[PDB]
């Protein structure tokens, strides 16, 4: 029993994590096969970040302008190239730690870990969502650029997010391991304001279901809804519409738990209207938005 | 910036984890040099677990009784011995993943990282703080027994607790690495209630000074206070007595933000008695109280 926000173990990850350094800059990198993937405003003085161009700036960059450390050992680097944000440095050693892997582009309201590092060395660990703004609520100081977000299915690290940003607000943005930024978001140094953080819908109920199974059911109430009706309160509230294809991804827990997805609905949407009146669910005072209800499954099964 | 529940990189702590199968139990080892570390419950039936005599059930087990399994390797266990509520197998291999480490006793109001474990195999990360009644708030399921808390100084992993029981109010007990009980209980399937979960008041605290680091600083107010008129409402809203001890280790916080320490406890003061008004606080709608100072500066500084 008990229910936390919980982590991947991140010691795959531990492996693959580098130092870059580029003149004064040093940031993390990401070490698979013979490539290590690194924020491409690593090339960047931090006056360079208002206004960049990478492709000039990149003309003035030799391989040996790249200083990658693995743990107290150099890497040789034999080439380099831009990938739209990211770079792509060619080390002459393939990673003798580089776990089976995918890149993977991943959807608002998916969640992962992320693993802050700073000079190439681990600092902890935390779980993170998309959200729906495409900003992630991050931990992240000066130095944790290319720490990386992943999952873990079994023995494969999905890696789905690499940190380049954080925004005027103190919100992070970051790009996939192909380069491409979540959201509306430029590797510059200027305006950019996040757009609206709705609450992730499906999460929430996910996590309600996680109550009802850990014993929190006093939000349990005779009601139910229509998703049309639901969408309604979901829309005043800022809460993402609930979709056909969110209530056939809690079927699972619906299943398990014996409440129908619209009945869950009536719950959470009293508690939108009515609040927690001082009450907790699972130790919050809030309604929790970053687990999936793969999430629920997995922490309540006990998946390794 | 931004402030996250972080636990330490797992890596470490990962390369030491093993299944330990008794008979029909299996649970988690901590393999650590040539010994392998596991609750002495592993030898009950659910049956022997209402009133067992561990010396006793102990004279019917012989080392190859003691299934021992590193990834998909068996361990050849050379010699059993019992230490408080603990098995200590000692195995013929090293494990040849064994970090620096230490066991340490840790006080109520500290907090760790569990890597919960099911079948010696790594589930996930999270962040627990040992509870003033001497209970962790965890998220274990059966199968997860001899999963490990711990902290990481740099290189060195200091290993403070081994997950044990279950109390019928879902919350948590275990042993040090030496096998003592935190707090009152013991290992047997018995009534056995947690006493008053208390707020960790200096923890409280040093994630005030988290939220004004991170720019979240809407609760700090005109007032002050003294150690004694704060404790008075502290023991009204069950929160632990501040001592000078507390006053001296946020010290470091008090410094970077130039808010006093009793000024702080002045606004923890005003929000326990006019609640958050449904505002948040670093994300939170409640006074999150794992963090410890030390948590704090590490998050807030980038400790690798
Ligand atoms: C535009 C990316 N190409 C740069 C380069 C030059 N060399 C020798 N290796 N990489
Ligand atoms: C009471 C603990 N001693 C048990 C034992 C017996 N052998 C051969 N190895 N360990």
Same mark, same amino acid.
Request: glycine share 8%.
């Given at each position: 029993?008990?229910?936390?926000?919980?982590?991947?173990?991140?010691?795959?990850?531990? *492996?693959?994590?580098?130092?870059?350094?580029?003149?004064?800059?040093?940031? +993390? *990198?990401?070490?698979?096969?013979?490539?290590?993937?690194?924020?491409?405003?690593?090339?960047?003085?931090?006056?360079?970040?208002?206004?960049?161009?990478?492709?000039?700036?990149?003309?003035?960059?030799?391989?040996?302008?790249?200083?990658?450390?693995? &743990?107290?050992?150099?890497?040789?680097?034999?080439?380099?190239?831009?990938?739209?944000?990211?770079?792509?440095?060619?080390?002459?050693?393939?990673?003798?730690?580089?776990?089976?892997?995918?890149?993977?582009?991943?959807?608002?309201?998916?969640?992962?870990?992320?693993?802050?590092?700073? +000079?190439?060395?681990?600092? *902890?660990?935390?779980?993170?969502?998309?959200?729906?703004?495409?900003?992630?609520? &991050?931990?992240?100081?000066?130095?944790?650029? *290319?720490?990386?977000?992943?999952?873990?299915?079994?023995?494969?690290?999905?890696?789905?997010?690499?940190?380049?940003?954080?925004?005027?607000?103190?919100?992070?943005?970051?790009?996939?391991?192909? &380069?491409?930024?979540?959201?509306?978001?430029?590797?510059?140094?200027?305006?950019?304001?996040? &757009?609206?953080?709705?609450?992730?819908?499906?999460?929430?109920?996910?996590?309600?279901?996680?109550?009802?199974?850990?014993?929190?059911?006093?939000?349990?109430?005779?009601?139910?809804?229509?998703? +049309?009706?639901? +969408?309604?309160?979901?829309?005043?509230?800022?809460?993402?519409?609930?979709?056909?294809?969110?209530?056939?991804?809690?079927?699972?827990?619906?299943?398990?738990?014996?409440?129908?997805?619209?009945?869950?609905?009536?719950?959470?949407?009293?508690?939108?209207?009515?609040?927690?009146?001082?009450?907790?669910?699972?130790?919050?005072?809030?309604?929790?938005?970053?687990?999936?209800?793969?999430?629920?499954?997995?922490?309540?099964?006990?998946?390794?």
């Amino acid at each position: 029993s008990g229910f936390r926000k919980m982590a991947f173990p991140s010691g795959k990850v531990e *492996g693959c994590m580098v130092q870059v350094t580029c003149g004064t800059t040093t940031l +993390n *990198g990401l070490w698979l096969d013979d490539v290590v993937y690194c924020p491409r405003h690593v090339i960047c003085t931090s006056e360079d970040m208002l206004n960049p161009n990478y492709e000039d700036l990149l003309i003035r960059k030799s391989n040996h302008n790249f200083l990658v450390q693995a &743990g107290n050992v150099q890497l040789r680097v034999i080439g380099h190239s831009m990938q739209n944000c990211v770079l792509k440095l060619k080390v002459d050693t393939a990673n003798p730690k580089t776990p089976k892997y995918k890149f993977v582009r991943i959807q608002p309201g998916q969640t992962f870990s992320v693993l802050a590092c700073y +000079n190439g060395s681990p600092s *902890g660990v935390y779980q993170c969502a998309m959200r729906p703004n495409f900003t992630i609520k &991050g931990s992240f100081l000066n130095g944790s650029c *290319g720490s990386v977000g992943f999952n873990i299915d079994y023995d494969c690290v999905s890696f789905c997010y690499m940190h380049h940003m954080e925004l005027p607000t103190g919100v992070h943005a970051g790009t996939d391991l192909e &380069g491409n930024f979540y959201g509306p978001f430029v590797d510059r140094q200027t305006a950019q304001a996040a &757009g609206t953080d709705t609450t992730i819908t499906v999460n929430v109920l996910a996590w309600l279901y996680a109550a009802v199974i850990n014993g929190d059911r006093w939000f349990l109430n005779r009601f139910t809804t229509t998703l +049309n009706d639901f +969408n309604l309160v979901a829309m005043k509230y800022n809460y993402e519409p609930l979709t056909q294809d969110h209530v056939d991804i809690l079927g699972p827990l619906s299943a398990q738990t014996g409440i129908a997805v619209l009945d869950m609905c009536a719950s959470l949407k009293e508690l939108l209207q009515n609040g927690m009146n001082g009450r907790t669910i699972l130790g919050s005072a809030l309604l929790e938005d970053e687990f999936t209800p793969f999430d629920v499954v997995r922490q309540c099964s006990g998946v390794t």
